[PDB]
Every structure is written in structure tokens, then in C-alpha cells.
Amino acid sequence: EFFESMAESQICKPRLLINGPKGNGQQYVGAAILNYLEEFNVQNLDLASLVSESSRT
Amino acid sequence: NVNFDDIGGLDNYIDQLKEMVALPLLYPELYQNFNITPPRGVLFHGPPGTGKTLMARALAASCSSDERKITFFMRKGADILSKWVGEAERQLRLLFEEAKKHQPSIIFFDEIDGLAPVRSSKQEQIHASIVSTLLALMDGMDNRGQVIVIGATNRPDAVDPALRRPGRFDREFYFPLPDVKARFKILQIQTRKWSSPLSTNFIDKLAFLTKGYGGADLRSLCTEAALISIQRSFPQIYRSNDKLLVDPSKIKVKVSDFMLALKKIVPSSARSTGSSPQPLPELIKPLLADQLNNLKNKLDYMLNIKDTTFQRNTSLLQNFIDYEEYSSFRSYEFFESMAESQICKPRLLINGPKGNGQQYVGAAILNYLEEFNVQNLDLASLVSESSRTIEAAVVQSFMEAKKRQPSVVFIPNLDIWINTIPENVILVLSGLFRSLQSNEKILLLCLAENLDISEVKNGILSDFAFDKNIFQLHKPSKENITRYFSNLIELLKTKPSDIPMKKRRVKPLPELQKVKELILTPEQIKKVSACLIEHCQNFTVSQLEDVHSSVAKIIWKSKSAWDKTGTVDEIIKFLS
Amino acid sequence: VDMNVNFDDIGGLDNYIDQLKEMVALPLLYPELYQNFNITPPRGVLFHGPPGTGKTLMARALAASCSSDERKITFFMRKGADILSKWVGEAERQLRLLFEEAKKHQPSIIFFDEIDGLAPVRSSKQEQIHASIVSTLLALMDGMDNRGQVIVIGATNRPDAVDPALRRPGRFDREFYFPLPDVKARFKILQIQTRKWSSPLSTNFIDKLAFLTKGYGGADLRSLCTEAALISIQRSFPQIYRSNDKLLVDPSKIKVKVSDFMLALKKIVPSSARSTGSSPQPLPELIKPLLADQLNNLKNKLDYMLNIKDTTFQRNTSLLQNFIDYEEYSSFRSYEFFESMAESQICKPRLLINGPKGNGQQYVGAAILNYLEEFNVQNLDLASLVSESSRTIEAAVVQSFMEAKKRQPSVVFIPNLDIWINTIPENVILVLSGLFRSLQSNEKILLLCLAENLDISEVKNGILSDFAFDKNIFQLHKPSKENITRYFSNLIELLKTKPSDIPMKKRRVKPLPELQKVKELILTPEQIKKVSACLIEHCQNFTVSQLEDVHSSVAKIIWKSKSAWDKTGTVDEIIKFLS
Amino acid sequence: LAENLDISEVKNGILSDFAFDKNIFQLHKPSKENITRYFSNLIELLKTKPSDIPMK
Ligand SMILES: Nc1ncnc2c1ncn2[C@@H]1O[C@H](COP(=O)(O)OP(=O)(O)O)[C@@H](O)[C@H]1O
Ligand SMILES: Nc1ncnc2c1ncn2[C@@H]1O[C@H](COP(=O)(O)OP(=O)(O)O)[C@@H](O)[C@H]1O
């Protein structure tokens, strides 16, 4: 209960915002990062994936 | 099969269901004497994996299945309705006549939401005919026979309101997620037919750890723990392609297997949005225990949770079996009117700075109120379902709170809730709360991060009467921060010989038959604590957790080192 | 669902029993009277009302009561839309056979339960499967050939879902509204359900149950009686709930007591509480000293607006009994003139109750709705309008007002008018006002609105100006000194009670038998007077909500020391609280 | 049918294209003779006998 707690307390609030100039290879950086985290469970929140389904708002 | 002893908790419902299925055939003369008919129809509602189907099957195959056998028909709401235009009503009629010929019968409609939903959408008119035929077929006061209709659902407000009347489903039974005692009983039930039954302290700790688990999650946890024990005790039987390496049973399911089963099995309470009801985590407890207890005292004053000597609602059959009865008239209604006169208007508004552990305080408070009917008005709990609008969802949540009287209308993130939730529905909720009687036990719990008080007294929340019941969450004191940052130190002071690392075995796995001291002076510890407290001055829980995580990474990176001078130096450098 | 019921089982619907006799039993025995005028008896009645009012019981009693002589009345009963199958043939073919076999056994009664599913309204899409059923039903019920002595009875929750072509003479010429029983009908139903019991209840206890069961239907009353009997069985012989073998018990000394009915009262929730509107219930006994002084005034005002106590005309509870006990007595100048001058007494029934914030309006509204027992309450509050997500605000308002137009004695109820005129769209109020001004003056549709701190300027020259709230504004003023004195006098009566009086339940010395298987209270009156004075002074110019808060806070203190005999501690705590 | 409808709305407003030019009928309040007949009908109830009233 102590060691699992202290190993699990190593993630506080994982956030990251990659911001750069216009057209500075963001579309490749995102793909490369999502490939680096291939063992995760990626949930895209882009516009194309939300307005694709006409039933759900 | 399943008897009543395979069911954890729900003893109230165990006794109450025996007066409509078991006693009516066992004692025909005590019911014919009063010219009464059993209710004949129940609505089980609750979170998935709580034991509604298990209740039904035990109920059918437990009440005297010797000469007066009770047949059991299992149907699902989505099963009855088909792609045709008259198939499903005919199927319902066939099912009911079939149950009629086998007169003592129990028809179990699992997930009756699909068969008969609420009338707010779904044109093409077939569902209206379905609801009408279900309403007409399950008439409970014309002696259709001895058919008991049991309908299972997640939440009863998703079922057609015409079905929740006498004759149709009479009694509604809430199947909650088990508490500590019920989880203990369920774990004992699941670990009863083992060859090496677990101890009592083991099961107690497991019940403590399994927070936000259901019956199905507990069964899966037990099964996976057993599987891991077989995987570990005799691992040669997997990779070897040879014949049976027979092995007897020295298998003992110990802690290190249940703890992996815990992290591999995900509970069904991890899917619902909002704050899952669970106590404060052991890490943050020193930061928020003292302020939580005060809240409990407040919740113990405005709700009468401790001094509930007149409202001790358990199986009243038990009350009759171990108590005895007693002008004689006044002593009932006078004292009963003066007993509900203590609850006047239960309101509470927890308001603190941003990130001050409100998601923990709300969950802990809800875990305190386990006997209440929590109706979550959270953002994701209303916008998730597309079958209802926000207005209707809020009104139905309020009215289900109103029906099951001990209830808590819970609104996490009130600051967001008063901006992205239109003023119309907020005024509707205000009018609904203004039409309640004072002696109604509906607590309005709200947790807001940096809410303005002028909003409470002059804004749109002015008609909710949050005038005196505003509890202010404040940032933890220096003493609490000292105790919070007193487990990293105990991780800085543990030598690498006590960290559960992995070391390869020098000898290979056998096969069966073919039939120092750590260099860290107390001055360094004192300096580390002094800097760790000086950096965290007037901090919130989120910021303290950030500092805790960033220091724990540093401590754990140098976990095999025996001279912590470098780790202490790095810790002081980061907090500078 | 065939027999063993009769018309003495039915309670509170004596007016419809006479007409059902007039259409079923009377033509059989006297065919010369009907053939004297060359008239055919009305055939087919549509029962509609709140669920659990007695429609199916009424149909079964009709089937089994007129068949007591040697003139059998076969009862063909059809559940709602159970006749349509996956193909296109049997839906009409089976109705054909039903009506032919009804013709064969000429005196017969077809009962379509939940007919709103068998004959839906013609929607935009999915026409065929229900239109092909409605058309054939219309064809057989009023075909060219004489259907015969077949009485068609339909039952529904609401009649608007039945096709209007069915609601036509020759098919459903009579529509019977089954209302929620009043106090007399509830008394009769309770007497009927507790008639076969071995130890009958007293008359005054049944009267008190009838008063306490406001909002219940017939089904709710039956469920309450069943629950009381079950509690009595649990209280007398708990042991049968533990053993799996049939123990030997005696159907004696299992008499039902008041305590069992009281528990069943909390175990049973009525259909009034399931609804989203304000449940009409009397003033709770605690607040009665505070509000009943100014509630009676409202009653008096209502007595002068709806002519409740002056009922000489439109006293139609039962026409047949009226012809039996009363006696008749140019023609126009003796009936039309006096009927017109009697209905000329209701001009425009309106009433706006407006008091300070928290002055017990949710209580006065329920009390008023309880006083108007014979009125049809329609709730226009926000919750009822927004509860049906398929409907719109305007559509719900129009539906409520049109429902109120039929069943003429009715009340359009708008609790929380201050909220209502701020969260409703501006055009809905105009639609409702246009509906109200499109009414005749002599129509008894009372507009009762309760508002908290509503500005009179909004009624004088605002959006509520076209509702005519001129003289019908009643101000709920804050309670006076004597009402507060009575409230806290009841509180003090609770304070000065002995612990031997306060009901603590028991701890039985001996276990239940197995069954054979087959000090002095010290409280000076000076302290009581001091506490009363402090309570009176602290609640100066208080509303009902603040008084209830003070009452609850002091009751917590009093109930804390419910066993202590030295009540000086509770007294000084009470005094310290009010400071 | 309208109550207190300003004619500004009907010769130059939204309803001006419905051609309500000379077809506007004005309902005026009842004159003294009408009120006299109404209240004579009312008073005739005061003159009726208690035994003449259709009290069943
Ligand atoms: N209260 C309980 N006590 C013991 N076991 C339970 C309980 N509730 C659920 N279970 C376990 O979960 C399974 C029941 O699942 P099910 O009845 O389908 O859940 P639900 O009815 O909530 O969908 C059974 O195999 C049973 O072993
Ligand atoms: N007016 C009444 N008089 C006597 N009993 C009634 C009355 N109304 C309802 N009941 C009781 O309620 C029970 C169920 O009524 P039901 O036929 O289900 O009504 P509905 O069809 O309107 O739901 C009946 O068994 C009957 O005993």
C-alpha cells in the first residue's frame, strides 16, 4: 500500500501544449508523438471526428 | 443452483420478496383470510453488476422448488422487439400465456429500458403499441394467476412512468453498489468453495481496497486472483508443450496476486462520469481530513444521521422479531410530526480556491452518505444521453430524488454549472426546490471552486437559500503540510534492500514428474523538510500534489543509491 | 378477470352505474320501452381517467352483474394491441372473428383495454400497420349490417390518442371520465376493501384514513389495505419469514391496528406524488396555527368567486337519484331564464396570492387545491411544461388549457409566478392570455397564481395586465404574534414531556415462541415563560420559513436531551442559541 | 377581431397589405338603452317570488 501509492503518485496532471508558428510542422509532430505513445489509448478530439456522426451531438 | 445464501446484502429485499412469492403458495390461508393479493411485480433498479438477475434466479429456484416448482422465464427488453411491425406484441402475448399455463411463474425482463422506454422520442408508433400491450398484459388486480413480473433497469426514470403504478410494478428495489460490510459478505461468498479459504483480516483488507466495486467486479477479481495463483505456483505448465505434468494443490492465494488482480480488473464504477463515491486517498488524507470531519459534523447536524433513533430503517421484520410493541393515539403523530421537524432545508455549498481538492471532498462526502439516494446533476450526467433534453433530465432527476425520500441532489463544479447550463433549467430547479415542503429530506450539495458570494446572494443561485450554509474550504495549514510531506522522507530513508525490485533467479525453474547503511544525516533530513515546507507557503492541494510528484520522481530515480547526498542536493535545487 | 365482482364492489361511481344499466341491462328486460320511440340503446362507452380509478373493475362488474338472471352476457376481453402479428393478415382477420363470435352470442360485451395502442392517431410516417386496423374496426363497429346487441367498451388513460372517427355515435357515443375518488368515495372504497376482514375497523378510523389518503386512487387504497394486512402478518407471526417449512399458525388475533396502517401509509406512494405538479394536501399540523388564520379568508374569497357553498343548480351528482328523491316543478321563462341567471354568478374567476419570500406559499397553494376537491387541477408550472421533452412550452400550455376547458370546473395553477414570468418565453404568456380572453365569462376556469414578492406594477401595466388581476390580489402577510405563540407553545409542550412518555420501542426479555411445523421532571414554569418570551422576541417580523428554521433548530436541542430529567441544560442551551 | 388595435398598424403597418381599407367595423360600448335592458332583466329576478323560483 505504501510502494504502490508512491509509484502511482508520480503522475500529477499530465498536460502538454505544443505551440509554434504557422505551418511549423505540427501535423507531423502530432503523428510522431502519437506513434511514440502507441501503447496508450488515443482519443482524438478534432473536429472531423466529432461532427462525423450525425446522431450524437 | 442459487439459493438465498449466495446473495450478499439485500436482506431487507430478501425478506420483502418472500411475502409475494414464497408465503403466498406456502400459506394460502393467511392471504385468503384478509382477501388480499400479493403485489405481483417488482422493479429492480441500480448500477450494473449489483445482483438483480441473481436476485431473480435465487428467488425463483429457492422458494420451495420441491413439489410446487416455480418456473422462470428469462427475457430481455431488446430481445422481444424485432424488425417487424407486429412481432413483438405477439411475442409478449405468447410469453404471458406461457407463464399463465405454468401458473406459479416469474417473468424476468432484464433491461426493460429497451422494451418500454419513456415517451419523449422514437416515432414510427411501434413503441406506443409495445407499451400499451405490456401495460394491458401485466394487470395485477384482476387475478391473471401467479405470474410475478420482475423488471431490471439501470435507473427507474428511464422506464415508462405508466409502468410504475400499482398493478404493474408496485415496489421498486434499489440495488446499490456494496458497502464495506456487503463487500465483505460477497467476498466470503465467492471464497467459500475454495480449498484454502482466505482469512478474515485478508477479506477485510480486500473489502477496504475494493472501493467503487460491484458484485460482478468482485467475482471477476476473485476469479482473476485464482488464475494468477495458478499461473505463479506452477508456471511450467504453460510454456511446456509436453503432456500432463500433474500437480497437486499447495496453491495459496496470497496478497501479491490479489493486488495484481486489483490493477488488472477495472470496476464498473470507473465508467460513470463525475466523482465516484470513495473515501479520501491515503496520500492526501492529512491535507483534507480535518476540514472533511467538520463537514461531516455539519452534515451530521442538518440531516440527523447519528441521532436517528426514530428512523432506523432496516428490515422491519427484524424490528418485530427482536422488539415488542409500545392517550395511546397522540404518542404516534405528535412525536412523528416533531421528528421530521428537525430537517428544515438541508443545503450545503462547499466553496474554496481553485484546485483545493474539491473532487476529493465531494467523493468523500458522498461516500459518507451511502444510505441516501444520490442524484447527480453533473454536466456529463445530463448531456450524455441524447434521448432527453437538459430540462427533462434535470426534472426527472429531481423527481426521482423526491420519490426515494432520503436523497442528495449533487451538483459538482457549480461554477461551470452556472455558465454552460442555461438559466431556464436553473430557474426550473429553483422552483422545484421552492415547492418542496420544509420537512423533506432532500439535501442540495454543491461544490464550487472560487465562486463569488454576490452570485449566491444576488445572482441566479439566490433562490436556493445558500445564505448561512456556505462552508469554506481553506488551504491546508503548515502542520498538515508537514504530515503530508512525511511520506517522501520515509521514502528517502528506506535503503535499497527494502524496495521490491526484481532479481533474476540464479537457478532455473524446477520440473515435476512425467505422469550496509544509507548515508543520510538527520541534518540533511531537517534541511529537506525545511525547504519543502518553505516552498509550499500558502499553497493549494493541487500545487502540493504537484510538488509531491516532482519530488517523488527525484527520490525514486535514485532508489538504488546508498548515498542520498546527491538526491538531497537535487531536491534542494529543484525547490529553489 | 372474468367474474366474482359485482356493482357493490364499486364505490363512488354511482352515476355511471345507472347509465350502464340503462344501456346493457334495461334494453334486455324492457324491449317495448325502447321500441316505443324507435330508438336504439347506446352501445359502446369509452372510459378514460387517471390510472387506477376502476375502469377494468367497472367493465368486469358490468359483465358479471347484468348476467345474474338467466340472460348470459359473454365477456370478450382484449388487451391493448395484442392482436397484430408480424404479417399483414391476422390483424384484421382476428378482429373480424372477434366481432362475428360476438354476434353469435348476441348479448355480449367486448372490452378493449388500453385501446389507445390498438387505434393510434394517424401520424406522418408508419401509416399502414395501424390504419389498416383502424379502418376495419370502424367498418365492423358501425357497418351497414346490424352489429347486434354487442356493447363495445373501450378503456384508456387519455382519449385524444384514440382516433376521432372512433369517438363518434354508434361506436363510442358515450365517454365516461373516471375521477380520482373524493373523501366519500375513498371512505366507501376503504370500507369495501376492509369488509371481509374478521376483525372490522371502527368507523371513525376509516374516516380518518379517508382524510389521510388524499390523492389516492382505488388501486392505491387497495394496495394500502394489502400492505396493512402484510404488516399485521409480520407483526403477529414473524417466524414464518425465517423457516422454510409451513409452520402452524391461526388466522386469529391477527387483527390490524392503527400502527400497521400508518406504516403502510409511508410504504405506499400515491399516483399524486408521481406526478410533477403540486400535490393537493391539507395544511400540516405544525404550520396550521401560522397560516390557517389567513387561509380561511382565501376560502371565503373563493366561496364568493366560485359559489361553492351555494349549490342549487348544477348539483348533478346522479341524475337518477335526483329524479328519485326530488320532484318536478312557462317553459322558457321557468328554465332558461333561471339557468342563465344562476350561471351569471361566475364572471371571471381569478386569484393572485402574493406574499414575501418564504411565507409558506407552497403550503397555501396545496391547501387551496385540497379545498377545491371537485375541481380538475391543471399545473402550468415549469416542471410540468418541460417534463415531456417531445412537447414544446407552447404546445404543453395549449394542451393544459384545452384539457381545462373540458371538465368545466377546473383550476389552471401556476405556482411560483415570479419565476414563471421570468423563465417562460414572452409569447407563451400572450398565448395563454389570448386563450383566457377567448373564454365565456360564465366559465369556471379559475386562474390561481402564487407569487413571491411580485411587483404590483407588473400586474398593473406589464405582461400580466391582460389577465385581469384587478381586485383579486390577496396579500399573504407575515404571521402575527398569536400564531407564533401557538407554534412555540406546541414546541414547549414537546419540551416539557417526561421520558416515560417519549416512545422508546422495546427490548424483549424473552424470544418469540417457536411454531409447530406441519424520577420526576424538574422544570420550573418561570423557565418555560422565559423560553417562550425569548422565542417570541427573536422571531420578530419573521416569515414562515424563518420560523420553521428556528423551530427545527430548537427541536434539535430539545430532542438531544430527550432522556435527561434535569431540563435546565436544554433550557440554557435554547436561550444561548437565541442570542 | 382585435381589441384596441391602432389603425396605424393597419393602414401603414404589418396588416396594411391585407387591404383593410374601408372594412373596419368599430364595436362601441353599449348605449344606455342596452344597459337598461340588461339590468331590467337582472332586476326581474329580484321581483320574482320565492315560491316562483325553480327550487326543486
Ligand atoms: N449481492 C451479491 N452477492 C453475491 N454475488 C453477487 C451479488 N451481486 C452480483 N453478484 C455476482 O454477479 C453475478 C450477477 O450478475 P448480474 O445479476 O447480471 O448483475 P446485474 O443484475 O446487476 O446486471 C453473479 O454471478 C454473482 O456471483
Ligand atoms: N371506484 C372504485 N371502487 C372500488 N374499488 C376500486 C375503485 N377504483 C379502483 N378500485 C380497485 O382498484 C383495483 C384495480 O383497478 P384497475 O381496474 O386496475 O383500474 P385501472 O384499470 O383504471 O388501472 C380494483 O381491483 C378495484 O378493487
Residue numbers in the entry:
A (entry chain F): 757 to 813
B (entry chain A): 410 to 735, 752 to 940, 1319 to 1379
C (entry chain B): 406 to 734, 751 to 939, 1318 to 1378
D (entry chain C): 871 to 926
From the paper:
We went on to first determine a cryo-EM map of the Yta7 in the presence of 2 mM ADP at an average resolution of 3.1 Å. As expected, Yta7 assembled a hexamer similar to the pombe homolog Abo1 (15). We resolved three of the six BRDs at a lower resolution of 3.9 Å. The three unresolved BRD domains are expected to be a part of the spiral, but they are too flexible to be visualized in 3D reconstruction. The Yta7 structure is three tiered with a spiral BRD tier on top followed by the AAA1 and AAA2 tiers, has a dimension of 150  × 150 × 135 Å, and adopts an asymmetrical overall configuration. We have observed the BRD tier in a spiral configuration in both ADP-bound state and ATPγS-bound state I. Because the ADP-bound state has better defined BRD region, we hereby describe the structure of the ADP-bound state as a surrogate to the ATPγS-bound state I. The spiral rises above the AAA1 tier with the proximal BRD–BIM blocking the peptide entry into the AAA+ chamber. In Yta7, the BRDs of different subunits have no direct contact with each other, and it is the BIM that mediates and cements the intersubunit BRD–BRD interaction. The active AAA1 coordinates an ADP between the α/β subdomain and the HD, and no ADP is present between the α/β subdomain and the HD in the inactive AAA2. In the ADP-bound Yta7, we identified four ADP molecules in the AAA1 domains of subunits A–D, a partially occupied ADP in subunit E, and no ADP in subunit F. Interestingly, the entry to the nucleotide-binding pocket is largely open in the ADP-bound state but is closed in the ATPγS-bound state.
The Saccharomyces cerevisiae Yta7 (yeast Tat [transactivator of transcription]-binding analog 7) is a chromatin-associated AAA+ (ATPases associated with various cellular activities) ATPase that maintains the balance of nucleosome density of the chromatin. Yta7 is type II ATPase containing two ATPase domains (AAA1 and AAA2), which is conserved in eukaryotes and expected to assemble a 910 kDa hexamer. The AAA1 is an active ATPase, whereas the AAA2 has no ATPase activity because of a lack of nucleotide-binding motif. By cryo-EM analysis, here we show that Yta7 assembles a three-tiered hexamer with a top BRD tier, a middle AAA1 tier, and a bottom AAA2 tier.
